[PDB]
Design an enzyme around this catalytic site. Structure first.
Site, PDB file in Angstrom:
ATOM      1  CB  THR A 106     -54.013  53.850   0.583  1.00 23.19           C
ATOM      2  OG1 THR A 106     -55.627  53.754  -0.564  1.00 23.19           O
ATOM      3  CG2 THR A 106     -53.345  51.974   0.492  1.00 23.19           C
ATOM      4  CG  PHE A 131     -47.838  57.473  -3.521  1.00 21.68           C
ATOM      5  CD1 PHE A 131     -48.711  57.296  -3.748  1.00 21.68           C
ATOM      6  CD2 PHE A 131     -47.138  58.355  -3.318  1.00 21.68           C
ATOM      7  CE1 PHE A 131     -49.860  57.961  -3.186  1.00 21.68           C
ATOM      8  CE2 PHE A 131     -48.174  60.085  -3.108  1.00 21.68           C
ATOM      9  CZ  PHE A 131     -48.721  59.757  -2.584  1.00 21.68           C
ATOM     10  CB  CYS A 156     -49.241  54.603  -6.300  1.00 20.36           C
ATOM     11  SG  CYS A 156     -51.211  54.491  -6.418  1.00 20.36           S
TER      12      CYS A 156
HETATM   13  C1  HEM Z   1     -52.449  57.492   0.307  1.00 19.98           C
HETATM   14  C2  HEM Z   1     -52.809  56.880  -1.389  1.00 19.98           C
HETATM   15  C3  HEM Z   1     -51.932  56.050  -1.158  1.00 19.98           C
HETATM   16  C4  HEM Z   1     -51.002  54.399  -0.858  1.00 19.98           C
HETATM   17  C5  HEM Z   1     -49.983  54.960   0.656  1.00 19.98           C
HETATM   18  C6  HEM Z   1     -50.566  54.315  -2.165  1.00 19.98           C
HETATM   19  C7  HEM Z   1     -49.708  53.536  -1.647  1.00 19.98           C
HETATM   20  C8  HEM Z   1     -49.351  52.351  -2.950  1.00 19.98           C
HETATM   21  C9  HEM Z   1     -48.463  51.989  -2.871  1.00 19.98           C
HETATM   22  C10 HEM Z   1     -46.774  51.661  -2.383  1.00 19.98           C
HETATM   23  C11 HEM Z   1     -47.860  51.266  -3.708  1.00 19.98           C
HETATM   24  C12 HEM Z   1     -46.884  49.883  -4.780  1.00 19.98           C
HETATM   25  C13 HEM Z   1     -48.164  48.664  -3.675  1.00 19.98           C
HETATM   26  C14 HEM Z   1     -46.610  47.096  -4.107  1.00 19.98           C
HETATM   27  O1  HEM Z   1     -45.661  47.358  -4.424  1.00 19.98           O
HETATM   28  O2  HEM Z   1     -46.502  46.451  -3.599  1.00 19.98           O
HETATM   29  C15 HEM Z   1     -49.500  51.305  -4.460  1.00 19.98           C
HETATM   30  C16 HEM Z   1     -49.464  50.910  -6.873  1.00 19.98           C
HETATM   31  C17 HEM Z   1     -51.042  50.709  -6.991  1.00 19.98           C
HETATM   32  N1  HEM Z   1     -51.940  51.399  -6.418  1.00 19.98           N
HETATM   33 FE1  HEM Z   1     -51.825  52.681  -4.836  1.00 19.98          FE
HETATM   34  N2  HEM Z   1     -51.653  54.204  -3.221  1.00 19.98           N
HETATM   35  C18 HEM Z   1     -52.501  54.905  -2.462  1.00 19.98           C
HETATM   36  C19 HEM Z   1     -53.877  55.366  -3.787  1.00 19.98           C
HETATM   37  C20 HEM Z   1     -54.142  55.000  -4.200  1.00 19.98           C
HETATM   38  C21 HEM Z   1     -55.206  55.206  -5.241  1.00 19.98           C
HETATM   39  C22 HEM Z   1     -56.417  56.425  -4.639  1.00 19.98           C
HETATM   40  C23 HEM Z   1     -55.467  53.726  -6.437  1.00 19.98           C
HETATM   41  C24 HEM Z   1     -56.111  53.614  -7.433  1.00 19.98           C
HETATM   42  C25 HEM Z   1     -57.648  54.312  -8.050  1.00 19.98           C
HETATM   43  C26 HEM Z   1     -54.191  53.455  -6.498  1.00 19.98           C
HETATM   44  C27 HEM Z   1     -53.964  52.928  -6.922  1.00 19.98           C
HETATM   45  C28 HEM Z   1     -52.773  51.684  -7.104  1.00 19.98           C
HETATM   46  C29 HEM Z   1     -52.637  50.530  -8.227  1.00 19.98           C
HETATM   47  C30 HEM Z   1     -53.594  50.418  -9.385  1.00 19.98           C
HETATM   48  C31 HEM Z   1     -51.720  50.272  -7.854  1.00 19.98           C
HETATM   49  C32 HEM Z   1     -50.944  49.536  -8.650  1.00 19.98           C
HETATM   50  C33 HEM Z   1     -50.100  49.477  -9.971  1.00 19.98           C
HETATM   51  C34 HEM Z   1     -48.954  48.582 -11.079  1.00 19.98           C
HETATM   52  O3  HEM Z   1     -48.815  47.510 -10.294  1.00 19.98           O
HETATM   53  O4  HEM Z   1     -49.076  48.825 -11.466  1.00 19.98           O
HETATM   54  N3  HEM Z   1     -53.771  54.110  -4.734  1.00 19.98           N
HETATM   55  N4  HEM Z   1     -50.134  52.197  -4.357  1.00 19.98           N
END
Ligand code: HEM
Length: 457
Positions: free
Chosen positions: A268, A393, A400
């Protein structure tokens, strides 16, 4: 008043799954949304999903009292190696709440000050790599941005150096991780799982999971035994207690959280940096305004935390690349109780809704008609953007957790790239977007010319 819901072409018993038998399925669902509109039923043997595209319906789907995160089929396959880490667990699993409460303060924008120096370390390696290219060579942009985000999460995560800029073929943990991920996205297509020939892939999948588990398990064990305190996420997990229950995270979950930060953060965030550089190289006026700001703000050999935060227009550039191509393009919701969407589409308890974020970000009623144009200035005043219009996000308490970590990284790196190099699209690249769990520009190459400014220490 109760309306209909379109359905694309069916192939009886296989229902609409051949429509998804493409190498680009999200871009294929964006072609279907263009002809059927803001919601459509998509049916495969066993499941029914409705895909949402307009902010009108998605603002409704984002009401947490009526809808909660769904584990889609992709995430259920990823749970085989990501387990009950934050990403692949249900809100109501006890370990989601416990990990969320412990980790939330460590992912705040204020906690980015502690990870900053570690992010500068890998950022300087990237810049120094490009400084050292000889004049006949070019940069493979997605490939060095994945080296940069793997190594930053490894080092901020559990203080381990994967040393991706010292290798051609990746550290074997990264190889296992990419291959397991790969296997999990391929099980979606294979309408006939379990056994024919797949048991070789299936045997291989077990070994990749073992490599991941064994390297992370050992890091944690060595950590508890030496007991040193660094500023990585693993020490904040080992010394953290959930205030609700008073419990710590157990060792098996801590591992899953580490694997989860890698798999959820690396593609991502590198996809984001690749798409932002594309649109800058394709839009010389934007590049010059962004490069001007970087040269004016980043006045020291290495950026301070406070200097990355003043890079206002680089942040607008990354927000507009996330509008046009959100690198994690869809998330899924299930209805908590029977309800009606918009006042016209009846939904039943447990029905799955999929938010198609790239279509949401192209809703002409919210963004205007220049929806396909790269204009960072749309974000000059971020409070003028309607609620639930911009969702790269995700939503609510399942958004996220890494939002602030990704944007600090991306701003830091993009600001240093623009500060130190002039870029040339020497091949006149044509955008081809490769799909995995994420979206990236396949084959984007650029030539960088140094401005010969010292990158000190
Ligand atoms: C351009 C960067 C990023 C985008 C577009 C992105 C986007 C997302 C999206 C859309 C979700 C929700 C997914 C869902 O609802 O099923 C999410 C969840 C999450 N993301 Fe990201 N992400 C990115 C960067 C990161 C980074 C750098 C990390 C961690 C070092 C990360 C860790 C997480 C975690 C652990 C979740 C789950 C949160 C929860 O449900 O408690 N993401 N991300």
């Amino acid at each position: 008043t109760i309306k209909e819901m379109p359905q694309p072409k069916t192939f009886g018993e296989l229902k609409n799954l051949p429509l998804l038998n493409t190498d680009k399925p999200v871009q294929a669902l964006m072609k279907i949304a263009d002809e059927l509109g803001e919601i459509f039923k998509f049916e495969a043997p066993g499941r029914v999903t409705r895909y949402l595209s307009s902010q009108r319906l998605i603002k409704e789907a984002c009401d947490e009292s009526r809808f909660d995160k769904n584990l889609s089929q992709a995430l259920k396959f990823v749970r085989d190696f990501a387990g009950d880490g934050l990403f692949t667990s249900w809100t109501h699993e006890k370990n989601w709440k416990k990990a969320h409460n412990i980790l939330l303060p460590s992912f705040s924008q204020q906690a980015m000050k502690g990870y900053h120096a570690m992010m500068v370390d890998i950022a300087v390696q990237l810049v120094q790599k490009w400084e050292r290219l000889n004049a006949d060579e070019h940069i493979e942009v997605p490939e060095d941005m994945t080296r940069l985000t793997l190594d930053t999460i490894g080092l901020c995560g559990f203080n381990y150096r994967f040393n991706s800029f010292y290798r051609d073929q990746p550290h074997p943990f990264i190889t296992s991780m990419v291959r397991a991920l790969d296997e999990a996205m391929n099980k979606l297509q294979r309408a006939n799982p379990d056994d024919p020939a797949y048991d070789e892939n299936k045997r291989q999948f077990q070994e990749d999971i073992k490599v991941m588990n064994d390297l992370v398990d050992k890091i944690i064990a060595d950590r508890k035994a030496s007991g040193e305190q660094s500023d990585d996420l693993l020490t904040h997990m080992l010394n953290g207690k959930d205030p609700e229950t008073g419990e710590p995270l157990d060792d098996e979950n801590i591992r899953y959280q580490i694997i989860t930060f890698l798999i959820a953060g690396h593609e991502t965030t590198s996809g984001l940096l690749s798409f932002a550089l594309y649109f800058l190289v394709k839009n010389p006026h934007v590049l010059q305004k962004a490069a001007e700001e970087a040269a004016r703000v980043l006045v020291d050999p290495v950026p301070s935390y406070k200097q990355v935060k003043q890079l206002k227009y680089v942040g607008m550039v990354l927000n507009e690349a996330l509008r046009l191509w959100p690198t994690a393009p869809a998330f899924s919701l299930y209805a908590k109780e029977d309800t009606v969407l918009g006042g016209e589409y009846p939904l039943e308890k447990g029905d799955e809704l999929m938010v198609l974020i790239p279509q949401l970000h192209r809703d002409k009623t919210i963004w205007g008609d220049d929806v396909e144009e790269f204009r960072p200035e749309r974000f000059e005043n971020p409070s003028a953007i309607p609620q639930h219009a911009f969702k790269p996000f995700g939503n609510g308490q399942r958004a996220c957790i890494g939002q602030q970590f990704a944007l600090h990284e991306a701003t830091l790196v993009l600001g240093m790239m623009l500060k130190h190099f002039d870029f040339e699209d020497h091949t006149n690249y044509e955008l081809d977007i490769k799909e995995t769990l994420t979206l990236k520009p396949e084959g984007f190459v650029v030539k960088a010319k140094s401005k010969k400014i010292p990158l000190g220490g």
